[PDB]
Design a protein around this ligand. Sequence first.
Ligand SMILES: Cc1cc(C)nc(N)n1
Length: 126
Amino acid sequence: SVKSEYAEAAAVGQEAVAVFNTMKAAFQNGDKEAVAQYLARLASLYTRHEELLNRILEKARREGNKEAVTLMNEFTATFQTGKSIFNAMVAAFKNGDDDSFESYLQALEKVTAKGETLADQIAKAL
Ligand SMILES: Cc1cc(C)nc(N)n1
């Protein structure tokens, strides 16, 4: 069901949380080789999460589930804010700009924590 597809998407989201927190520790410790690998892992995870979310939104639309479509439109919009910040973080790492990396890292954390009430709302709506 679309509901079980959303639980699979939620797990991929939690995997990115886990890797992101490990990556933050590596960044603080100056282990740039680890950071590079974690950033590649996160890009793959976000790409997967984004695709699963789009399929869920498209299905909710085909089902006529108006409330779920509303919430998923809002949620995917916030997802893109996170993605833009993530991409900027990756660029800051490439450029050696640790000040911007720190800034983007904190912003991505706050964007992500803010989106969690909506994430739970969607599970109930599907
Ligand atoms: C990139 C991103 C953004 C938001 C709001 N939530 C998640 N899980 N991932």
